[PDB]
Amino acid sequence: AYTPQYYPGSSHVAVNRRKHMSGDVEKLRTVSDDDLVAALGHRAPGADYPSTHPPLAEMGEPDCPVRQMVEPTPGAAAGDRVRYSQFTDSMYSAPSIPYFRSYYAAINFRGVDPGTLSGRQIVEARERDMEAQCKAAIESEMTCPALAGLRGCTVHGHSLRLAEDGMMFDMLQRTHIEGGNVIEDKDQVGVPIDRKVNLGKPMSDAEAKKRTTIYRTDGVKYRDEEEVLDHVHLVHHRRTMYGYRPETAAETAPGVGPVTYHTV
Template sequence: MAYELQYYPGATSVAENRRKHMSGKVEKLREISDDDLTLVLGHRAPGSDYPSTHPPLAEMGEPECSVREMVEPTPGAKAGDRVRYVQFVDSMYNGPSVPYFRSYAASINFRGVDPGTLSGRQVVEARERDMEEIAKFQMETEMTCPALASLRGATVHGHSLRLPEDGVMFDMLDRCRREGDVIIMHKDQVGRPIDKKVNLGKPMSAEEAAKRTTIYRVDNVAFRDDAEVIEWVHRVFDQRTTYGFKPEN
């Protein structure tokens, strides 16, 4: 019998959503054009070439190396792209993703990524075109709600702040706004104004966000109600503790 990946314990919708994020089998909800993505990331002008830090690998005359032969370079590495970042901030008010599960999703489903996980933000650094691939994947799928998640290179504390009345996560730098029934972004990740308003799509309704979220909250799916997850955390705790306690050594 083939082994089936388990990913994560738990019997609740939050646990199920976490499994989805980790597996990469998430629903696509919207389209972001390549040029719009480039604009909001703010690393280069739309349509411009990828700046490179070295010639394409094929022109480099790489040394003989079994590891290099075994591991296929990512497209960005092949082309010699520089390393750039995408950073997401997720509201704790039922934002669809959370920092750890963005990192797990990146590590499991994408190659050549360097995820960093903090409380308010989650960053992935990668060769530029590889980074754009994972950025686009997250922005277009149920991993992101344009009102409750946002690209932010700096000032990320909106994640824990009360929601403004329009339901768009607080942003000190006012990068995103609700216009009509969609969310637009008029500044790039680090808050520099951009030439056009980028349509990020419709925000999730409160009900949809509650259904798709990966955060436990007492007013939605309470952590204390997911007994299997707590039991699993206890098991990890037991094992780490007793592993270190080895008086016979």
């Protein structure tokens, strides 16, 4: 079968990007089921999953050939509500960047609705499926609990100076450091919870730069990653050419000029 290559580039940042896309992300910490459910804020830990419609087996389905060959996720079969996890990630070398969180979701999980924005990245899915996807992300090297956190609202912070203790600014201060560990004591929409969810130690600055997918001047400078720039240019050029005419001849139409690439 076809072997994916995912993304160009040769720096360790490009290597990290391919790790996130391929799902080959190291597990770094453990978050209990009850702690994660409390943080997400959609139901009480241990409570039954609420439903938005009856289980498929109980209500039946239309005679659709696609339904009959596409297996529903566990949460879809059960009729769970569609709920969400949402993360914000610092531009000061957080492990994750928004688009690559969405690629991780889209490549590696079934029945997911990821969304990418500058200051927030969301995964919507049937509740129990969403929980499993969030657990994978939050336990992995995609997360530093100082540089990233669950924020379902009031997300400001990705682009701000870090606090003196290295925590990304949160207007609602849903997390804080206690004894070297990041503690979350509000749910993702700012409601106090009756527990202290221990997300463990923040990454060192050096570890963050080894694990990050972002290019910036204090790490891997974007200007030096000529393979990614070539890729961007190739895609823009071919889009421009084929919007004019969808044929090979458009690639040398008048107006293209002496286009040139670094590595190809």
